[PDB]
Amino acid sequence: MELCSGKPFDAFTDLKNGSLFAFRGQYSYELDEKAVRPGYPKLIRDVWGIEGPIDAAFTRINSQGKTYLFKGSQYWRFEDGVLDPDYPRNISDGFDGIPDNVDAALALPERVYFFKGKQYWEYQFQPQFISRDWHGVPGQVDAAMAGRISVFFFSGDKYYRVNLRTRRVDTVDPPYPRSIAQYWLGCPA
Ligand SMILES: [Ca+2]
Ligand SMILES: [Cl-]
Ligand code: NA
Secondary structure (H helix, E strand, O other): OOOOOOOOOOOOOOOEEEEEEEEEEEEEEEEEEOOOOOOOOOHHHHHHHOOOOOEEEEEEOOOOOOOEEHHHHEEEEEOOOOOOOOOOOHHHHOOOOOOOOOOEEEEEEEEEEEEOEEEEEEOOOHHHHHHHHHHOOOOOOOOOOOOOEEEEEEEEEEEEEEEEEEEEOOOOOOOOOOOOHHHOOOOOO
């Protein structure tokens, strides 16, 4: 399936050195201005060595910049695009109190947020309600990604941008939620 199909996404890694990966079904999409063929559909099995679909992803913004991919009760940890030793692991082994089958995740430089249903968990290296703490985000999300000053929440074929300081949905034209394909990916539409 092509990047600009208009279909919902499953997961996004966090922005690292200006690039990230998008996941949908069995496919991995590399989004980087410096890439020769940005957004070519590659198999997750080829790039990451695991079967899609994946539930959630995040990337730490420390020196090592490890990427974490979640599916079911399992997670995989990558550095330099290679699976670390002793992965995959049960989520319970690395992430005390975080549930299985998460909807989304994002990392901030150090906290990770995990999203599932109407709730989210904070993990540092009880659940709270998404809507109470992420003002204007209506509840359940499919995917999430953190940048520098904003996080992005993906719901179906649309998304929200949330300011990290205010934890509020930004006021843009046309307003959030809006098309991922048209306004986030810059897809010809
Ligand atoms: Ca997901
Ligand atoms: Cl995600
Ligand atoms: Na993510």
